[PDB]
Amino acid sequence: WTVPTLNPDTPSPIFGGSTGGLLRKAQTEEFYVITWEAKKEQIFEMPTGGAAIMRQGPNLLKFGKKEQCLALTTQLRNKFKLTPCFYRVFPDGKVQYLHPADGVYPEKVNAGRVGANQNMRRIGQNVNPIKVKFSGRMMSPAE
Amino acid sequence: ATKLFPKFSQGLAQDPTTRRIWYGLAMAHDFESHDGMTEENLYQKIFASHFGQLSIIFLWTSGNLFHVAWQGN
Amino acid sequence: GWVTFYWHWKHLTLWQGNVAQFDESSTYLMGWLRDYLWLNSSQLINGYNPFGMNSLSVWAWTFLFGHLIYATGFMFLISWRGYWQELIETLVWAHEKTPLANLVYWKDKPVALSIVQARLVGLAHFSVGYIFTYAAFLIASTSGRF
Amino acid sequence: KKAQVISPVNGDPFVGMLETPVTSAPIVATYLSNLPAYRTGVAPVLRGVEIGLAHGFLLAGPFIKLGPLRNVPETAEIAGSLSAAGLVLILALCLSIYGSAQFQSTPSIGVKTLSGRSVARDPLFSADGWSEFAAGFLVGGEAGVAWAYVCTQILPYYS
Amino acid sequence: KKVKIAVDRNPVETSFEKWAKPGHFSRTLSKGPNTTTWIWNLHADAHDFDSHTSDLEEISRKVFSAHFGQLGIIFIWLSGMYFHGARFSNYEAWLSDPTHIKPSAQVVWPIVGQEILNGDVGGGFQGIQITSGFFQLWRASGITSELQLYTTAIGGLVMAAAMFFAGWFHYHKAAPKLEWFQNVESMLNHHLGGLLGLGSLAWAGHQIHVSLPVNKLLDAGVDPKEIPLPHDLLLNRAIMADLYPSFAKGIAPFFTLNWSEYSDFLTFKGGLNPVTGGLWLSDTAHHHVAIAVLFLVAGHMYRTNWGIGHSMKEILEAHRGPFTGEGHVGLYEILTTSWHAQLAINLALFGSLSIIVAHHMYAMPPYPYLATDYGTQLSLFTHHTWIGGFCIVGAGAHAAIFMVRDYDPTNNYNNLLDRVIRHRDAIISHLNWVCIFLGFHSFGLYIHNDTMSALGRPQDMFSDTAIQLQPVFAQWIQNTHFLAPQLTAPNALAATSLTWGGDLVAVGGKVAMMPISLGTSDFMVHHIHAFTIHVTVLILLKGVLFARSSRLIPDKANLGFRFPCDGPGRGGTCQVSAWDHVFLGLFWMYNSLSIVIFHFSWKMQSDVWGTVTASGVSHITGGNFAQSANTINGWLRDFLWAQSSQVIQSYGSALSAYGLIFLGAHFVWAFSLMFLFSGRGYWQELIESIVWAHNKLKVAPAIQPRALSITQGRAVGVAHYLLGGIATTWSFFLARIISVG
Amino acid sequence: AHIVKIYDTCIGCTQCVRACPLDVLEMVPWDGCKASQMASAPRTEDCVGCKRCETACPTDFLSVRVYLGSESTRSMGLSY
Amino acid sequence: EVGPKRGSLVKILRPESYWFNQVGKVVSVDQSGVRYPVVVRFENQNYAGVTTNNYALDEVVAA
Numbered sequence A: 001w002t003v004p005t006l007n008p009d010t011p012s013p014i015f016g017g018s019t020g021g022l023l024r025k026a027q028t029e030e031f032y033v034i035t036w037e038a039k040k041e042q043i044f045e046m047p048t049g050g051a052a053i054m055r056q057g058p059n060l061l062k063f064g065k066k067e068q069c070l071a072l073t074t075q076l077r078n079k080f081k082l083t084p085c086f087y088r089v090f091p092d093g094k095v096q097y098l099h100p101a102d103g104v105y106p107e108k109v110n111a112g113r114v115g116a117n118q119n120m121r122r123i124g125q126n127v128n129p130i131k132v133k134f135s136g137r138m139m140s141p142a143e
Numbered sequence B: 001a002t003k004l005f006p007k008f009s010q011g012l013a014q015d016p017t018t019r020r021i022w023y024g025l026a027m028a029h030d031f032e033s034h035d036g037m038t039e040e041n042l043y044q045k046i047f048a049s050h051f052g053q054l055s056i057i058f059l060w061t062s063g064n065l066f067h068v069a070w071q072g073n
Numbered sequence C: 001g002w003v004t005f006y007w008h009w010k011h012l013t014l015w016q017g018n019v020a021q022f023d024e025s026s027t028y029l030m031g032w033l034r035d036y037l038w039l040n041s042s043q044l045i046n047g048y049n050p051f052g053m054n055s056l057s058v059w060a061w062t063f064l065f066g067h068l069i070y071a072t073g074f075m076f077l078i079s080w081r082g083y084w085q086e087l088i089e090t091l092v093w094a095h096e097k098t099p100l101a102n103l104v105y106w107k108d109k110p111v112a113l114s115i116v117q118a119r120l121v122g123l124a125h126f127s128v129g130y131i132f133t134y135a136a137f138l139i140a141s142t143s144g145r146f
Numbered sequence D: 001k002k003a004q005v006i007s008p009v010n011g012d013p014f015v016g017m018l019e020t021p022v023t024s025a026p027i028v029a030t031y032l033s034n035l036p037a038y039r040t041g042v043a044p045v046l047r048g049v050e051i052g053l054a055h056g057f058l059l060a061g062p063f064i065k066l067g068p069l070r071n072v073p074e075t076a077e078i079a080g081s082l083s084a085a086g087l088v089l090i091l092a093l094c095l096s097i098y099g100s101a102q103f104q105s106t107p108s109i110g111v112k113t114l115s116g117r118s119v120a121r122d123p124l125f126s127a128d129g130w131s132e133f134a135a136g137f138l139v140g141g142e143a144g145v146a147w148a149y150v151c152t153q154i155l156p157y158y159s
Numbered sequence E: 001k002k003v004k005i006a007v008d009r010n011p012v013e014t015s016f017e018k019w020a021k022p023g024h025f026s027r028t029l030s031k032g033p034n035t036t037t038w039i040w041n042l043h044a045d046a047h048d049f050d051s052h053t054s055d056l057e058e059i060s061r062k063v064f065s066a067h068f069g070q071l072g073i074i075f076i077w078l079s080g081m082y083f084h085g086a087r088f089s090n091y092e093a094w095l096s097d098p099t100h101i102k103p104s105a106q107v108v109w110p111i112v113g114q115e116i117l118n119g120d121v122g123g124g125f126q127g128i129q130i131t132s133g134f135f136q137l138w139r140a141s142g143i144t145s146e147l148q149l150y151t152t153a154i155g156g157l158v159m160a161a162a163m164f165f166a167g168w169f170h171y172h173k174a175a176p177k178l179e180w181f182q183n184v185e186s187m188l189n190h191h192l193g194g195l196l197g198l199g200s201l202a203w204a205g206h207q208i209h210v211s212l213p214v215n216k217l218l219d220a221g222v223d224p225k226e227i228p229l230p231h232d233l234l235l236n237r238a239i240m241a242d243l244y245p246s247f248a249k250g251i252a253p254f255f256t257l258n259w260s261e262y263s264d265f266l267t268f269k270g271g272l273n274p275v276t277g278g279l280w281l282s283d284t285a286h287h288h289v290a291i292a293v294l295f296l297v298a299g300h301m302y303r304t305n306w307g308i309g310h311s312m313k314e315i316l317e318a319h320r321g322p323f324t325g326e327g328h329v330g331l332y333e334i335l336t337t338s339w340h341a342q343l344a345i346n347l348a349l350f351g352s353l354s355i356i357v358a359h360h361m362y363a364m365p366p367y368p369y370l371a372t373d374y375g376t377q378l379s380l381f382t383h384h385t386w387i388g389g390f391c392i393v394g395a396g397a398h399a400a401i402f403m404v405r406d407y408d409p410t411n412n413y414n415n416l417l418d419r420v421i422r423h424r425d426a427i428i429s430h431l432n433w434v435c436i437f438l439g440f441h442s443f444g445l446y447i448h449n450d451t452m453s454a455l456g457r458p459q460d461m462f463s464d465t466a467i468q469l470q471p472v473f474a475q476w477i478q479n480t481h482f483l484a485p486q487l488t489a490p491n492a493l494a495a496t497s498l499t500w501g502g503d504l505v506a507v508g509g510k511v512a513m514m515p516i517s518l519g520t521s522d523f524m525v526h527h528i529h530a531f532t533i534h535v536t537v538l539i540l541l542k543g544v545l546f547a548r549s550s551r552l553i554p555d556k557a558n559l560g561f562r563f564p565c566d567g568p569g570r571g572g573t574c575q576v577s578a579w580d581h582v583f584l585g586l587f588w589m590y591n592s593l594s595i596v597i598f599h600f601s602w603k604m605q606s607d608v609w610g611t612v613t614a615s616g617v618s619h620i621t622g623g624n625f626a627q628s629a630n631t632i633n634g635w636l637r638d639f640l641w642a643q644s645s646q647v648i649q650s651y652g653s654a655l656s657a658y659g660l661i662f663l664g665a666h667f668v669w670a671f672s673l674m675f676l677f678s679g680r681g682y683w684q685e686l687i688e689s690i691v692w693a694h695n696k697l698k699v700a701p702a703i704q705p706r707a708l709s710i711t712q713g714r715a716v717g718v719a720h721y722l723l724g725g726i727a728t729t730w731s732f733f734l735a736r737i738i739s740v741g
Numbered sequence F: 001a002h003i004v005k006i007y008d009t010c011i012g013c014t015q016c017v018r019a020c021p022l023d024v025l026e027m028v029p030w031d032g033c034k035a036s037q038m039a040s041a042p043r044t045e046d047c048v049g050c051k052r053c054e055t056a057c058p059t060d061f062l063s064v065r066v067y068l069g070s071e072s073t074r075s076m077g078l079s080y
Numbered sequence G: 001e002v003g004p005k006r007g008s009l010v011k012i013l014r015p016e017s018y019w020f021n022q023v024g025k026v027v028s029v030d031q032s033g034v035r036y037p038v039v040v041r042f043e044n045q046n047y048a049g050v051t052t053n054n055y056a057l058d059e060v061v062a063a
């Protein structure tokens, strides 16, 4: 598996237009693009509001928030049994792949993804906040 | 981008929302949760703040005295 | 509030020579309502009427002021963040899509008051209204008689 | 059953504005495009003068007919015009501090015009542009309040 | 044939086996309790039939039999009121003198000193003065005897037992299938022809044959003992042809379409009866004849088994516009598939109807001596107003529940519901703006008047004197309905109400109904009404449209309808659910209707109700509403402080219980604030520190003590808030108006 | 950014990852408390702080722990 | 083998546990080098609704 490049030639589902779509965050900070290959035309539920019709084949869809993309991801994975993958697009054109960051979905092991933010102690073996006092910023004993 | 108002907290100064203003108004005197605060600097800022409270109290009594003397009977 | 109600009524009945009214009515709570809160509000709330006003009108206005602030704290105390954040999402849409007004844009993103923050804000509105209401009532019901 | 009126904005169903007769009727878009706010090629100082003249002329009326001195015959218009002058001054200060606050980032994304041609950014949305816009707003607002007073003084059927 | 009876024989066995096993209706609670939250969930999910199972047939059967149980309970309650009017009332004494004797139908036992509550109401009676208006209703029915109330009570108990037998039958013995419930064409045809058409026709028959002659003789001074019994007015046509000579013609004028001959008992008089202060029963009889015809022709509209008629699916599907996409398609399926979509509409219109009832029962008092019982009139406005607001909030609730559970986006593509959910942001944004606009321009007017009159500038207030905001549109409508019989309703002898204008009707010295003027105070309070209504609509509609998703939480539908929060994340997500929007819409419904009923009470006591002893109408508060209600201090002083003198000095008198429920309601309301201001996590730790003391003494229960759910805390808080506030208002109203009115 | 720490009491039931609506958590093999999986939080820049993860953690209390930290646009669920 | 038997009653010594100083019954003890190997089932459920939890050999004690 290798990181897929975002295809802009991918069509979008049949949506009649909403008001829950993109805001100035898309133009200024960032927005998100989710893609998936469908086997048929199915009326799914937009996380922004309203129902859209996915197209037979590949689809592409814009969203202003990552939680929207993962909501649709779990909806397409659980109700339609698809395998979508979304990105993070910046207004200058930079695309950043996000969800299956190793190819497989994060609930499954991949035999090589590194464990981050793992405290190797018990939650009661954390120190008292008096020991992490005056560490610069206000810091939790979990660090 | 990163703002300037919460000089005492860099996590708030990077907040893009209106929460920065409020939480900087309400974390201003929690000196021990400031950025880069030591214990000695804490005690010193508290010393100066007590001096400021004293000045304010005495100005308040001066104002009561002044207004009773001026606009009172 | 209980402490100061007790003090104020005991002393209003002492100063008026009517300690018997307290000795009779303070043993039940309709006594405290009627003979203390309802009775002694007579000049306060008539501080201003459609016929005119007197010097107690400031304390009447302040009375109603505290009644407003207290109840406004109820808004931050009962309604919680998530109704208001979605409301503000709608208002963000409304501002970004309104012509001649999307020209003007915020620099700080409008979000609802946080949980702890609105707890403090409701407590502050509550306390200010409590305090102002009782201060107005006290000063007006004591200055109106004496 | 054909001929649906409501369309998405510029054909994009994911942006979220839903082009609608109140939004993008020919007459409505014509009127909004002709307003000095949306004349992104003219100098912002003059658009500010025009906007300020309008707003300073309209907001004298309330202070005149509803102010505290509305019932004394000749002092009413003077009082309301001075009040509108003060409010225009306050608004000009608001505009100046808004220009201080907003225009520091210079966002790099372009602007199109619902037909593809990449127009330039409005010089109004720049620090110097908004400075001169608030200058024009002050000048035009005070002038419009003064002329509102004048129109109370000279108009025949001013009741 | 399509529309037919379709039932299953003996679906559910009748046994107490599932009575001994609580929580049987769900898969989670049937395992048994381990924590106390189970005890609350057992009750919160008791009638949540659409989560006990998925098949709409069993849900529908449960709903049907539950409705039967509600009907049986309503019949028990009605029979109880008739029985209390038969045994424990002064009704037969009140009929002889309804202008002097207070209607009472509840006697209190003399146990712990509450015999003081058995007030001197009149007619040699001692009891609690009722305000439900049953005496006026019974006089209008033509009862005139306690035996008829007794037998009506026994008939109500018979019908209650019948309804409960019917629920048991239609659940356990022969329960209908889903395709029987789904015949909405037949249900509407029948509920319009037979239920509301034939019901109004039968009530018209009673009004022709029993109410009209009995009440005509009652108004002619005849003693209720010497009035002919209704069966004697049925058999002996001579009595009726003496009272109405058109009964000498028989029913021929009907079949010959010489209906004008019937103009003796089918009238269009309009206005009020000068001797009773209520609507003419001939007017009501003609009314019910007319609406019976109307509903019987309206019940022949939909197509059931013979090709004539309409398919509601065809009306809906063929109603679509260029602005609205596919239109009403899929709504037939929504409403024949979702019980909650039906419940939402039905509750909304039923509550709006109850408020219609409240407004139309005081301006057009239908019953004799109803208007001059100011307590009954005030209570009957307040009660139905409150029931309407509650039903409307429940309509918003069940609309949200539909949107969460029963909504399917496949059925709804570019139909009206999809197109609403797609632009909910425009909807709620404009609603927010109008709520803010109205709040400012309706309450800041009151604040402006408070500030002006406090500063001593009454010439700067918003009053009928200084700066007039006259309600010219309502004034024009008043004048348009006052002048209606002259031009636009020539066969009406008078206007519908005297509130439009004209002369007053005073009965027994008391004012039954008089013209109602509207000025700046009425403008301001009406705009306050619209403001509060719009905010309640904002909350409930925002809960509906954002019940599945928002820009904050896109997966709110999977979270559910009733959930506290997703977390403290996204800055904090508490009360994002569509349940918490109902929880807040309850508060705003209370705030709206409190002002509505306050407007009613003050306007009635100031500008309508009163006595005429000499030449001059002397009202209760002296018409202060015009000049005093421009300020919040006005509603304080001259309404909440002035009209509270009767409830706080009621101690030691018959109305002392009203003062008691004043104080206790103030208690309960404030008690609600323990649940609304606080949060579960504090009480769980307090509870576990208490459980430590219970463990130490070996008295810790097996059912683990938990703090109430978050949702349950909010529900308890809103319940205690509404109860205390409404009961405080109830006590205040009744104690005030039983004394001064 | 909020602080999500995961402790060695994690029995590896994947529930915290399935509950996460922002794809902050993932399950790493054997480079943790033991073999047979373990969780991890590499993408905490996208954590909003909803604590669905520790709502779904079945261990005593919570192996996964969200400590609410400095907010941003990604950590406040803002589409604006 | 390590730990208690697979039906024994066990008092939990984990300080942050809901069942601290509370008796539980062993479901099983994983005989690998796993940390927190002891699986204890409790008659009463915690605030999350769980009745089972994994504990270490030093967090368990008889009776």
Ligand code: CLA
Pocket: E012, E013, E014, E015, E016, E018, E019, E025, E061, E062, E063, E065, E066, E068, E069, E070, E073, E164, E165, E166, E167, E168, E171, E172
């Ligand atoms: C005595 C006769 C009888 C018997 C033995 C049963 C037995 C059963 N019924 Mg049937 N049922 C009956 C009569 C009976 N029913 C009647 C008369 C009705 C019409 C209302 C129904 C309608 C009905 C439905 C719709 C359902 C059942 C169900 C059930 C099962 C469990 C019910 C349960 O938990 O009961 C215990 C419940 C109660 C004791 C509640 C009684 C509520 C009464 C009616 C109203 C009282 C309200 C009260 C006035 C409020 C006071 C307020 C207070 C604060 C003062 C069981 C097979 C359920 C089933 O099959 O699910 C598997 C089911 O869904 N029954």
Ligand code: CLA
Pocket: E063, E064, E067, E068, E071, E180, E181, E183, E184, E186, E187, E190, E191, E193, E194, E195
């Ligand atoms: C002329 C025919 C007719 C009449 C009078 C009614 C009347 C009623 N129906 Mg409807 N219904 C009908 C036809 C009719 N229905 C048909 C054909 C269907 C199939 C589509 C339905 C399906 C239906 C459902 C699904 C529900 C009702 C409900 C109701 C009741 C609503 C409660 C109310 O308004 O209080 C008014 C109360 C009264 C007027 C009290 C007297 C009731 C009398 C005794 C029964 C009416 C006659 C009855 C329908 C015929 C059978 C008599 C029986 C001896 C066999 C009401 C009694 C609801 C209800 O309350 O359920 C219990 C409900 O859930 N009905």
Ligand code: CLA
Pocket: E201, E202, E203, E204, E205, E206, E208, E209, E233, E234, E235, E236, E237, E240, E246, E247, E248, E249, E250, E251, E254, E262, E289
């Ligand atoms: C549902 C409403 C209703 C009902 C029930 C009645 C009933 C009655 N009206 Mg009224 N009426 C009504 C509405 C109603 N009215 C309205 C709306 C108007 C205004 C137009 C009038 C205007 C009016 C006038 C002007 C008069 C009446 C009269 C009558 C009576 C004569 C009936 C008659 O001649 O019709 C004929 C009806 C039938 C032939 C049906 C009889 C059916 C029987 C009962 C069948 C049962 C037999 C059974 C199968 C077997 C026996 C069982 C056992 C013994 C073995 C009767 C009491 C007359 C009267 O007596 O005045 C007091 C009269 O003069 N009515």
Ligand code: CLA
Pocket: E043, E044, E045, E046, E047, E048, E049, E343, E347, E390, E391, E392, E393, E394, E395, E397, E398, E401, E561, E562, E579, E582, E583, E719, E723
């Ligand atoms: C025709 C009327 C009607 C019908 C059939 C329903 C039916 C239903 N509603 Mg809806 N609802 C209604 C009116 C109605 N509601 C109204 C008027 C409101 C506004 C208050 C609501 C608000 C509402 C909400 C917010 C919710 C429901 C829910 C439900 C479902 C389960 C209700 C349940 O189990 O409660 C069982 C009964 C109780 C728990 C008793 C409540 C206790 C009350 C508050 C006590 C106070 C009442 C008393 C008169 C005051 C005196 C107290 C005295 C005892 C001291 C069920 C489908 C729930 C649902 O479907 O969610 C999944 C839900 O969350 N309803």
Ligand code: CLA
Pocket: C068, C071, C072, C073, C074, C075, C078, C079, C083, E431, E432, E433, E435, E436, E437, E438, E439, E440, E443, E444, E447, E535, E538, E539, E584, E585, E587, E588
């Ligand atoms: C007295 C108590 C109080 C007050 C003033 C408010 C005020 C408001 N609520 Mg809240 N609310 C409260 C209690 C209160 N609420 C309680 C107890 C609950 C139950 C939980 C709620 C639940 C609730 C919900 C659920 C909603 C509201 C909404 C609203 C707004 C609608 C009205 C509006 O914008 O008009 C304009 C503002 C007012 C009328 C407030 C008074 C201001 C006056 C006019 C003077 C202005 C002063 C002026 C600017 C001078 C400034 C002086 C300078 C020195 C600063 C407003 C902010 C709604 C909302 O935000 O959407 C629109 C909404 O959806 N509230």
Ligand SMILES: CC1=C(/C=C/C(C)=C/C=C/C(C)=C/C=C/C=C(C)/C=C/C=C(C)/C=C/C2=C(C)CCCC2(C)C)C(C)(C)CCC1
Pocket: E074, E078, E194, E195, E196, E198, E199, E200, E202, E203
């Ligand atoms: C609102 C309400 C109420 C009340 C109500 C009422 C009162 C109603 C009524 C209703 C009604 C009052 C109804 C009625 C109905 C009736 C019917 C349904 C009848 C039927 C009959 C029939 C069906 C017959 C037939 C026939 C004959 C026998 C003659 C010949 C021909 C024929 C065959 C046709 C209350 C407050 C309590 C509560 C709440 C709710």
Ligand SMILES: CC1=C(C/C=C(\C)CCC[C@H](C)CCC[C@H](C)CCCC(C)C)C(=O)c2ccccc2C1=O
Pocket: B025, C075, C076, C077, C079, C080, C081, C082, C084, C085, C111, C112, C113, C114, C115, C118, C119
């Ligand atoms: C009304 C309301 C809002 C909306 C309030 C908005 C977001 C902010 C208030 C609007 C402006 C900023 C009012 C400012 C007026 C103050 C007088 C400013 C004084 C502060 C200075 C002294 C610094 C919430 O965000 C909320 C959150 C959680 C629980 C309850 C509530 C709640 O009740």
Ligand SMILES: CC1=C(C/C=C(\C)CCC[C@H](C)CCC[C@H](C)CCCC(C)C)C(=O)c2ccccc2C1=O
Pocket: E674, E675, E676, E678, E679, E680, E683, E684, E706, E707, E708, E709, E710, E712, E713, E714
């Ligand atoms: C007071 C309070 C509590 C504590 C209330 C406790 C848990 C329950 C109150 C009393 C219960 C119902 C015990 C009453 C007695 C039992 C019904 C058993 C009967 C035994 C004899 C008395 C007959 C909360 O749990 C809570 C949660 C969320 C928001 C606000 C609050 C809140 O305000």
Ligand code: SF4
Pocket: E569, F004, F019, F020, F021, F022, F023, F024, F025, F046, F047, F048, F049, F050, F051, F052, F053, F054, F066
């Ligand atoms: S708080 Fe929410 S977003 Fe953050 S890690 Fe936990 S579940 Fe994921």
Ligand code: SF4
Pocket: F006, F009, F010, F011, F012, F013, F014, F015, F016, F017, F038, F039, F053, F056, F057, F058, F059, F062, F063, F064
């Ligand atoms: S839910 Fe808890 S136990 Fe399960 S994998 Fe996540 S952190 Fe570990």
